C-alpha cells in the first residue's frame, strides 16, 4: 500500500457581518481539508487548524515525503515529516499542517484494517459524548450582554448541558455578560468562559475573583500562550480552573505548559497539536500530574469526526465507576459547510453527540460540497 | 507614508547533484524575497529563512494587516502582525515570514530617514567583519574526508580566518573529517563544527571529547532544537563551546534556550528569529548572562545585507578595547543567484566583508535576476 | 555630526513649608536638566532623576566620553558611557545621570532625522494618555486625613480618572486616610497607594489586607527596594497588586526584580532607569512574564515630555482591541518651574495629556526660565 | 560630641603617559579624601573609591544629615545616611561616598575612646600583613610581556611574596604575559591575575584552562560585575579560584554575589563597599558559606590605613593554628601623593606591612600635601 | 588589660506550686550569672539562658581559654572560644554559655572605654522601650481561662500596651483562653500567643485560623525548633505572623531558619544566641529579607540589662519617621531575685522601661543578693 496523491481543499463562506473575539476579527469562515489517495484506491481525509491557505502550502511542502510511502506506518511517517520541516517549524503551522495529514493517514489505516480509529487507538470507553455550546462572537452594533443572554438561553432550550462564552474585552463589561448569561440559563447549566488571551494577568485575576460566584467551570486562555508564568499566576491568583492548549503544539509545547503548571485542563486540538499520533503522546503526558484533557474542537465535520474518535478512546484519569468523561466543544455559529462536507451530519441531539464506529473516521465526504464552498482563487 | 503592496519573489536553481547535511537533503537552492512598496514610491526588500513557498504563503496571509499601514512604525506593525497569526504561530514559519516583512520595513524606514539600518539600530561599532567559510555538503559518491580537507585548504588560500565543517552523520567518520581538515588548514586557522542536530546526546558528548584536541571554537546544533535539556548536557559533558539558535524563534524561544543554559553562543538569524525588531530584543536577553551572539547567515545577498547591518550595530559584551566582535557566516557552495539579486555583490575580500552604509540595507536589487532565477510554477 | 558641549542646569524653588513622604523630607523643589550641543547647532535636552547636584557632577564626569562623538549613535554611546563609570556605578546615580544624557541624545537624533522620538522608538500606538493625580505630601500641622480627602476631591473635579495617595507612615492612620479619600472621590475614580518604602513586611501585608475593600488598583513601594524577597511576600500576602521600579535601575536591576516576582506593575522612570535606550530593554524583559509597565514620572516638563514619547510607543501586553494602556503619573504639588522650562506647557485637560509629535521630544526649552529658577551657588 | 564640618579634598597627579587596564584608560592619579571635624576639635579622615569629583559631590549631599550628629553613633549615622540617598543610590557612588564618611567617623570614634579602630572592631589577630604587589598598566608603545616580566622580577627582589598582573586584553597575549612573569619570578613567588572584566565568559574559561599550569592563586574580575551567572560559569569551567568584590557594593550586592556562588574570594574595598560599618556585615555573610575575604585596596595612605585596621581585625575562617590570613594589595605604580598625605608612610618592608595601633586609623594627615597635590579647579 | 578570674553564680528560688508551659514543668526559678574579673580590678557581668548548672559547667570549660586574655578583644575571644568547644557544640549549651561570657566581656569593654554597650554597638536610636507582659503559667487546680483573663486585665491596669499568653496545650481550651483574654483586656491592648512548641502542624494551623479574629500580633514557637519545614507550613497556612528564635542559636542556626522562611519575627535571646557579638551578626542576616527582630527576654536583671542595651542600638528595618521599634518581653511571674541582683531595679513604669546609659551594662550587681539566693549545693 502506497500513497499516490496528496491534495488540499480550501473552503470559504462570507458572513453577513464580521465576527470578533478578543484575539481576532474575521469576516468569513475559512477552512482546509487534506485528501490522501492510495494506490489501491483508498482515500483518507483530514483537517488543519488555523490559517487555511498557509496550511495548504505547508501540506504541499510535506507532500514530497509522503508520495510512495506506506500510509499504515503512521509513527514512521509522522517522525519523518516532523523532522523534515522541523528547523523552521516546531510549533504553529508546521504542526497544524502535519495534524491534517496525520488524520487522513489514520482514516486510511482504519479503512485498510476495517477498524474505527477509536478501536485502533486502543478501544471505545464510550459511544457518545455530551456537547457544550460555544457562544456567539462580538458583532458591530450588537449588545454583547443581551445577545449572549438570549443565545445561551436558546442553547439551553436545545438541550446543551453547558455553554462557554467569549470574554477578554474588558473586565467590567465581561462581568455583565457573565452575570446575564447565568441569569438566562438558570442555576444548573454549566458555564465556562474563554478570554481568547485578551487579558493582562491583572485583568484575568480580577475577572476570575469577581466572576467565580456565578459558578464557572473553567477559564480558557486567560493570557497569551507564550507567557506560561502568567498562566501559573492566574491559576494561583483566582479560583476558576484554568484551561488552555488550543494554541500550544506537540509533545514539547504541551510538556512546557504542564511543567509550568499552567493549566487545570489541557485542550489539545486534533487538527492543531499533531494529529492522532501526537495527541496520544500528549494524553500520556497529562497523566503524570493528573491534568484533565478536554479537546479543543473548531472547524468542519472532518475535525468533528476526528475529535469524536479520540473522545471515544480517551482513558479516564482516574478510572472509577462513572468517571469524568470528555465533553465536546460545539460551535453553533453560522457555517453552511460545517456539516455539508459530510454525507451524514454529526450533530448534537438533545445535547449529545453519538460517535461513529465505521472504519477510519466513520464518515463519507460529500465532494459536491467541496466544489460548492470552494474558496475563490486569489 | 502608507504601504500599498506586498509581494514575494521565489528563486530557484537546480544543483548538479543533491547536497546533504545530517538534517536535510536537497537538490536545489530555493529562497524567497519580500518586496514592500509604498505610496510615495519607496520600496523595501527582505528575505525569509526556511521553506520558500510556505514562507511566501504566510507573507501573503500577513499582507492584509500591512496594506494601508505606516511602514515607519515597525514596533507597532511587528506586534500587530505577531498577534494576528500567533494562535497557530509562535515559532517556525509564522516568525520566519514576519522576519522578511520586518527587514523590508526597516529598509523602507532607512530610505525614508536617509539612514543606514545600522545607524537606526543605534550606531556602527565597526565598518567590516571577518567572515568564516562554511563547508561543502555531503554528496553522493564523494569522500567527505578528502573533499572537506581540500575545500577547506581552498578557503584558507582565499583568506578566510576560520571555517566550519558539517558533521552529525556518525562519530568515527566525523572525527576523521575533523582531523583531516585540521591537517589541511594548518594550526592557526579557526575551526568550528556543525552537527545539524544529527546526534544523540551520547554521540555528541563522545564526539566533543574526542574532537576537542583538534582545536574547535564551537559545536553548533549538537542535538535537536526542542531538547534543551540535551543541549545543557552536551554543554556540561564535553569541552567545546556549544552554539545554537538558527532553529529557535523569537524572544520567547530564545529566552527558553538561555534560561536552560543551552548555549555558549546564541545564533539568531535575521530572516528567521523575527527580523531586526526582534533580534534587538534577543540581543538584550543575551546580555543578562553574558552569552555571545554570532548571527546565523544562510541565503541570498538580501539576507547577507541584513545580517551585515545588524553586525555593524552589535554592542560588545563586554565593552573593552579590541572586544570580541561578530564574525560573518559565509556559505561558499554554489548558488548563482546569491549575489545576482544585488546590483553590487557583498563579497569577502581576503576574508573580510565591508558593511554597506547607504540608506536602509544599503543595496539595490537587480530585478532582472529575480526573473532569471524565478522558481517555476508548480 | 559631533557633540561639542555638554552642560547641566540646576533648578530650585523653596517651598512654604517642608513636604514629607515616608521616605524623605524636603523643603525645596530641586532638579537638573542636561543640555547637549552639536557642531551643526542642534541642541538636545534631558533630565536626571534624583539628587540634583550629584547628578550634575556625574554628567560632568561622563562628558569626556561624549565630546567629539556622533550623537546619532545612541546605543554605542550608551554602552561606552555605561562601561566607563560601571566599576563604582551599576545602579543609582551612575544610571540616573546617564538617563539624562540619553534623553538629550534621543532629542538630537529626532531633530536630526526630523522624527518624533516616539516614531524612532517604533511607532505611536496612541496620541494621548489619561493622567492620574498624585497626592499632597505630609506637612507640619496639617491633618493628612482631611487634607487628602479635600485634595483628591479637587483632583476629581479637575477630571482626573484616578489618583494616588501617600502612605507608609503607620497602618492605622494610613487606613483612615485611604477611607476618607475613597469617601471623598466617590465609587468610580480609581485609587492607588504609595508607601515610599516606609513599611515593614508585616505592616504592608496588614495594610493591604485591611485596605483592599476600598478598591485599590496598586500598592507602590510597600517595602525597601533592596529586599526583593519582602516584595514577593507582600505580593503573596495581601490582595492589592504591587508596583515598584522608580528606585530600581537598568536591565540588570529590573531583571533582578522581575526574576524575584517582585511586582505586578513595573515602573521604570525615563530619567532614572537608563533613558530611552535602556527602557526599551526593560520593556522587553517585562514581556517575558507579562508584567505591566506603567512609567514612574517625577520632575519638570522635560521629564514629562520624555515620558510622553515613551508612552506613545509602548506596545500593549497583550495586543487586543482597546488594550490596557499606560497612564501618566501627574504630580500636582507646587512647582513653578515644572512647566516654565517649556515654551508650551504639557498639561492635563480634563484628565488627558496629549503627546507631542514634533521632532525629538517635541518641545522648546525656555532658557529664561533656567535663569529665573537657577539653583543658588553653594 | 557633635560633627561641625564635613569637607572633601581632591588630589591629582598627571602621569607621564596614560595607563590602561582592560576596564579603563587614565592619564592621572585622582583621589578624594573626606575630612570630618567635631565641636571638641576632633578630626577624622576617610577616602572614597572611584570617580573623585562625583564622590565629593555625593559627600556634600550627605553633609546635611551629618552636621550636628554625634559621630560616635556610627551605626545610626550609617543607616540614616544610607536611607537618605537610597532611592537613586543602593550601589556605586552612593556607597563609595558613604564609605569615606564612615571611615572618618570611625577615626573620630577611635580618637574619642583612645582606641585603634582594629580594637573597636573586636580585636587584633595580627600586627602585620604580607603584601602582594600589583603590576604595571598597559602603556603606549610598551611591550606588556617584557615590561611585566621585568617589573615583577623587581617586585620579587623587593621581597614581595606574591604579585598580581593585569590581563583581560586578549587570551593569547595575556598567556604570553603570564608565562613570562612566571619565568621571571621563579617557582615559589605566588601569582594572581586580574582581567578587569575585560573577557567574555568563553575567553575567561579558555584563559583559565590554559593558564592554570603556571600556578595561579586567583583570577580576579574575569567578567563584568553584573553578570553573576557568568562568574559562576567561569568558576565552574576552569580551575583557578575566582575573585571579585571591588565593583560590588553593600551587604545586598555582596549577598547577591555570594548567593550566586560567584567567587572563591570576596574582595570588599573599605572605601567602596560601605566602610567599616558595612564591611563587618559583609564579613559575616562570607562565613555562611566559608568564602575567604581578601580586601581590595586602591588609593592613598588613608585607604591603606583603613584597610590595615580591618585586616588586623579579620577573624580567620576557619580558626586554626597558623590560619589563612589576609594579604595586602599594594599598588607600586607611580603616585607621589599616595604616601605624602601621611606624616609617616605605611610601606612594605621586605614585603610586610606593619599595622598601626594608635587611636583611630593611627595616622596623622599631612595637610601641606593636600595643598601641594590639590586637584586644579575645573 | 587581662582577664584574671571567671566565676559563675547559681541562683534559685522554690515556687509555691509548679509552673507549666506546654514545653516544660518547673518548680523553681533557677538561673546562672557569669562574673569576669580583670587584672586592673574591672569586673563584668553576664547571664546564660537555659539549664543553670550545665551552663555553669560549660563556662568553667571555656575558662581556660579566657584567663590571661585581653577582654577588650571580643571578636577574637568569641571566635577562639566558639572554635574551642565547637566539635560537640554548635547549638544549645555551648552557645548559651558563650553568650553569658560575651555579655560580661562587653560589660568590661564599656567600663574600660567609659561607654555604654549601646554606644559601642553603634549608637542609641531610643532611650526607652515599651514592654509587653508575659502571662502566668499553667498551675495545678487553677483554671487557665479565668486565671489568664484576670491576670491580663491586671497587666492592662499596670499600663502594659500588650501581653502574651501561653497556649500549646490543646486547641479548644487554648481558644477559650484567648477569647477570655481578649474580652478582659479590651479592644486596643495588643495580644500575642506562645505555644512553647506544644502543637502539631495541624493543631497550629487550626488554632491560628480560629484565633485570628481575636486580633493576634504574633504566634510564637507554634512547632518544635528543629522542624523548619513545619514552621513554614504554619506561616503559610494560617494568618497570624509567626515568631521564633529563643530556641535557635548562632548565625548558622538563625540563617537556617531565615533561609527556610520560618518566621515573620525573629527572636534572638542575648543570653542564648551568642551574646552581643553574635546577635549583631544575626541582626545583619535579618535585614537580607526584612524579617523583624524582637528579642526574647527571660531571666534576671542582668539579662534584662543586656537586652535593653541591644534594644537601644537596634537599627530600624526600614528606617522611617516613627519606625517599628523593639518591644521588651517582661516576665511578671514571681521571682524575688529577678530585680534583687541589681542595686537599682530595671522596671516598667506605666509599661515603659528606660534604658541605662552608664558604662557597660549600666548596672551595679548586688553581691548580697547572690548569697541570699544562692542555689543549694547538690
Ligand atoms: Ca478557545
Ligand atoms: Ca484572588
Ligand atoms: Ca548551522
Ligand atoms: Ca566528557
Ligand atoms: Ca512613588
Ligand atoms: Ca492576607
Ligand atoms: Ca582589581
Ligand atoms: Ca575547563
Ligand atoms: Ca517563648
Ligand atoms: Ca488556613
Ligand atoms: Ni450563510
Ligand atoms: Ni549552477
Ligand atoms: Ni512658589
Ligand atoms: Ni610624578
Ligand atoms: Ni517567693
UniProtKB/Swiss-Prot annotation, chains A, B, C, D, E:
One of its GO terms (biological process) is amino acid catabolic process. Homooctamer. Its EC number is 5.5.1.27. The lineage of its organism: Bacteria, Pseudomonadati, Pseudomonadota, Alphaproteobacteria, Hyphomicrobiales. Keywords: Isomerase, Magnesium, Metal-binding. Mg(2+) binds at residues 194, 220, 246. The record marks 269 as: Increases basicity of active site His. This is D-galactarolactone cycloisomerase. Catalyzes the ring opening of D-galactaro-1,4-lactone to yield 5-keto-4-deoxy-D-glucarate (KDG) via a beta-elimination reaction. This is a step in the oxidative degradation pathway of D-galacturonate, which allows A.tumefaciens to utilize D-galacturonate as a sole carbon source. To a lesser extent, can also use D-glucaro-1,4-lactone as substrate to produce KDG, but cannot use D-galactaro-1,5-lactone, D-glucaro-6,3-lactone and linear D-glucarate. The gene is gci. The active site is at residue 296. Pathway: Carbohydrate acid metabolism; D-galacturonate degradation via prokaryotic oxidative pathway. One of its GO terms (molecular function) is isomerase activity. Belongs to the mandelate racemase/muconate lactonizing enzyme family. Pfam families: MR_MLE_C, MR_MLE_N. SUPFAM superfamilies: Enolase C-terminal domain-like, Enolase N-terminal domain-like. InterPro entries: Enolase-like_C_sf (IPR036849), Enolase-like_N (IPR029017), Enolase_C-like (IPR029065), GLI (IPR034618), Mandel_Rmase/mucon_lact_enz_CS (IPR018110), Mandelate_racemase_C (IPR013342), Mandelate_racemase_N_dom (IPR013341), RHMD-like (IPR046945). It comes from the Bacteria. PANTHER family: ENOLASE SUPERFAMILY, MANDELATE RACEMASE (PTHR13794), MITOCHONDRIAL ENOLASE SUPERFAMILY MEMBER 1 (PTHR13794:SF58). Its cofactor is Mg(2+). Optimum pH is 8.5.
